[PDB]
């Protein structure tokens, strides 16, 4: 019931520019992790170097400059060095972090894409969702999208089921999670309702357990096999921004607009602990008064270790104890 900082990274023009981190993700083996955001670059870090080096030294091993602000990253689960990005122009790109080059650009979305996800079980497949109200499924072997879903509202988040590339969870601005069987997109297989605002994130704890976040200041747990609402989590403030959601088999973690990371155990509806970002030199670069928010989080897949980042560009590695 405590969070502890074991590493902190401030890299970039932190005090003179915008540095919101929109996405932070470990690669397939939890060896590297990457950040992306409004500063128009993808940074790749070596996790072991980060947690074992001295501070004021932390730097990425790779920095890839991009044309547009980035909204999301997803590492490929089979080609370890491949990573997908979505950006504010709608473009979905797959990069090689070793050569620092783009491998493929998918340019069908007409508006900002919020989310991308590489499938674990069919690893050539990539799904994206956008303000243009479309879900698009891409195959890295092909130039055009292979599936398109015309939806009624902005798509804020997309995620493949971890056990099957035939199912995706889709978080919509219409306040619902649309759970699609991609073999028949005529209608969603299930629609989960209960949130009072847009569904900003969807993440699977398992093949049948799905978590969601919403700007109604709740996280919610669902069973996508039994088509049931399971639990609602409250205690954090999230009425406006994308503040991050990450889950493992037992815990849900999210950001907040009070510059705080929260951790929930999946069976308890109040937070078990939290960590508060912020520092003297950012208090009066003024405005931890209300403006700073956590903006991305990601559990390590094999440890109670959490990557975290906020709207000022600070990255922390936390451990749960």
């Amino acid at each position: 019931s405590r969070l502890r900082v074991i590493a902190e990274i401030r890299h970039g023009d932190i005090f003179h520019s915008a540095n919101i981190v929109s996405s932070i993700e470990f690669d397939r083996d939890d060896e590297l992790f990457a950040t992306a955001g409004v500063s128009r670059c993808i940074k790749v870090f070596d996790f072991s170097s980060v947690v074992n080096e001295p501070a004021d030294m932390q730097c990425p091993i790779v920095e890839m400059s991009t044309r547009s602000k980035l909204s999301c990253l997803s590492w490929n689960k089979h080609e370890k060095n491949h990573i997908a990005s979505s950006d504010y122009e709608g473009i979905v790109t797959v990069w090689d972090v070793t050569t620092r080059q783009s491998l493929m650009e998918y340019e069908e979305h007409e508006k900002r894409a919020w989310s991308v996800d590489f499938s674990r079980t069919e690893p050539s497949m990539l799904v994206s969702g956008s303000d243009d109200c479309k879900v698009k499924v891409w195959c890295t072997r092909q130039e055009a999208s292979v599936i398109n879903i015309d939806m009624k509202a902005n798509i804020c988040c997309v995620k493949y089921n971890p056990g099957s590339s035939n199912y995706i969870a889709v978080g919509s601005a219409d306040h619902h999670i649309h759970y699609y069987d991609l073999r028949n997109i005529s209608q969603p297989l299930h629609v989960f309702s209960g949130h009072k605002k847009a569904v900003s994130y969807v993440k699977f704890l398992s093949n049948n357990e799905l978590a969601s976040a919403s700007t109604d200041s709740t996280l919610r747990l669902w069973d996508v096999k039994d088509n049931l609402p399971v639990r609602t989590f409250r205690g954090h403030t999230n009425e406006k921004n994308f503040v991050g959601l990450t889950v493992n088999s037992e815990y849900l973690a999210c950001g907040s607009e009070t510059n705080e990371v929260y951790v929930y155990h999946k069976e308890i509806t109040r937070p078990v602990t939290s960590h508060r970002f912020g520092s003297p030199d950012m208090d009066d670069a003024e405005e931890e008064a209300g403006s700073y928010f956590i903006s991305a989080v990601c559990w390590k897949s094999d440890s109670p270790t959490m990557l975290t980042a906020n709207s000022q560009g600070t990255i922390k590695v936390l451990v749960l104890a």
Binding site: I20, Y88, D131, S172, H175, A198, T215, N241, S311
Partner: peptide, 8 residues
Amino acid sequence: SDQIVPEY
């Protein structure tokens, strides 16, 4: 502003 969740 950036990273704001759309409303509908």
